[PDB]
Amino acid sequence: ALRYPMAVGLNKGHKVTKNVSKPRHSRRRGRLTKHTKFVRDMIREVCGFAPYERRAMELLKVSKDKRALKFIKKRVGTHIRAKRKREELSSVLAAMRKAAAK
């Protein structure tokens, strides 16, 4: 058919050629590096876990995952931050099982 660019609709906009360039280096901020992961895993060996993290893990051992999130969320503050935190502790608990199994 005949079709025009339109100021409304799903394909709205004046048509231009998009140009692809490397992302600005400021956009990699907060990317984990193997050295910074190694340093954080070392501090985790020296220091350990916080009392709230340990209490969360006790909830996760008995498979109280829903209650574990609510405790974590109440302590860290946000759902997304808690979801990421619950996952790490479960990964830690999973690793401890494997190490014991070995």
Partner 1 sequence: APSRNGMILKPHFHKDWQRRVATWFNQPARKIRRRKARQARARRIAPRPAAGPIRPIVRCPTVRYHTKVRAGRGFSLEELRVAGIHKKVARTIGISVDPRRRNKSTESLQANVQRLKEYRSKLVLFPRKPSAPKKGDSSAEELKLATQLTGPVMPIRNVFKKEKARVITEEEKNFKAFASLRMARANARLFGIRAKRAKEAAEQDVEKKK
Partner 2 sequence: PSRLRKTRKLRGHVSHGHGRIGKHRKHPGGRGNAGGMHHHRINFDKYHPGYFGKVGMRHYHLKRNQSFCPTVNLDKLWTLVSEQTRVNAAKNKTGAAPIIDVVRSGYYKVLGKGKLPKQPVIVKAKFFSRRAEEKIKGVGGACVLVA
Partner 3 sequence: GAYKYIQELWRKKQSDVMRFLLRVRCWQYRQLSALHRAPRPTRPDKARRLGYKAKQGYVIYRIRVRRGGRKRPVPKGATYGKPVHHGVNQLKFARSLQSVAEERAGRHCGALRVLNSYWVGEDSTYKFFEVILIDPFHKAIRRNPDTQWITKPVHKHREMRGLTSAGRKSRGLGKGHKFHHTIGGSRRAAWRRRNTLQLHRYR
Q: Which of 1, 10, 14, 100 binds partner 2 (CB under 8 A)?
A: 14
* Amino acid in position 94: A
Q: Which 11-40 positions form the footprint of partner 1 (CB under 8 A)? A: 12, 14, 16-19, 21, 24
- The pair of three-digit structure tokens given for residue 19, joined into one six-digit string: 């140009």
Say whether residue 23 binds partner 3 (CB under 8 A).
no
For the stretch 42-71, what's the b/e string if a residue is b when 16 or more beta carbons lie within 10 angstroms of its beta carbon?
eeeeeeeeeeebeebbebbeeeeeeebbeb
- The residue range among 8-16, 44-52, 60-68, 87-95 that interacts with partner 2, by the rule CB under 8 A, is 8-16
Q: Which of 1, 32, 43, 100 binds partner 3 (CB under 8 A)?
A: 43
Distance CA 99, CA 102 (A): 5
Closer residue to RNA in complex, CB, 3/67: 67
- The pair of three-digit structure tokens given for residue 43, joined into one six-digit string: 């501090």
Distance CA 92, CA 88 (A): 6
Q: Which 41-70 positions form the footprint of partner 1 (CB under 8 A)? A: none
Q: Site residues (CB under 8 A) for partner 1? A: 2, 4, 6-10, 12, 14, 16-19, 21, 24
